[PDB]
Design a protein around this ligand. Sequence first.
Ligand SMILES: [Zn+2]
Length: 255
Amino acid sequence: WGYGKHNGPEHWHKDFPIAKGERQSPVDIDTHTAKYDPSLKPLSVSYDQATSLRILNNGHAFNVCFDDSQDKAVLKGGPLDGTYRLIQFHFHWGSLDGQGSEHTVDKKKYAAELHLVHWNTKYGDFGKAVQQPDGLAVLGIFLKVGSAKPGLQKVVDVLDSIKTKGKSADFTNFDPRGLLPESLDYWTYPGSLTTPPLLECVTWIVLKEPISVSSEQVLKFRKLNFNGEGEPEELMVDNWRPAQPLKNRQIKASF
Ligand SMILES: [Zn+2]
């Protein structure tokens, strides 16, 4: 599977039939239809002891993986019951500034989307958690192009070390608090992983406020390669799944 004409999102259902399920992600967020829920709690983002390990080019995007063997970087509150541990973040992005996000807002696409992936500690490990309807919480943050994001620059700086598929580099002491916008106002809905295996395990928490990154920062994302070293060069762009049908779901708003 991938993002091309012959293996992209329209093909995924042939290997991952859940691709046509009842709670697939991403979705369009229709701002006028989202339901304000005053009983929704503020988000609690506790990233003060985060332990980043490494950065990997996985062939589809790049991951930054964290030590999730203790409560070091956790998401609580909002729509969540219990404690979700940060395992990784990654991005989805476009070939052009007018596309690249997975979620849309009134059908508007952003240049990119950051996913901070967390799992519910009551299930013991990430592999157990992805098999549960409340196993994961993914915090989604839109990227627009404008001013640089200083907290992203260390990520941009190391991408030359992981240009091709399967390359990894040490990436310790990275502070993911540098990727957050000012407001933690959010939308929330039940959905899925947006790549195979497309499991329906995710509570999506999508922040209202985008972050802005510079032209130079997003251009460095687009110089990554899908291919392995010595295979035909294919730029790593447009690694996003389009909006899926909302079906029997209500998007709730904290605001
Ligand atoms: Zn993602």
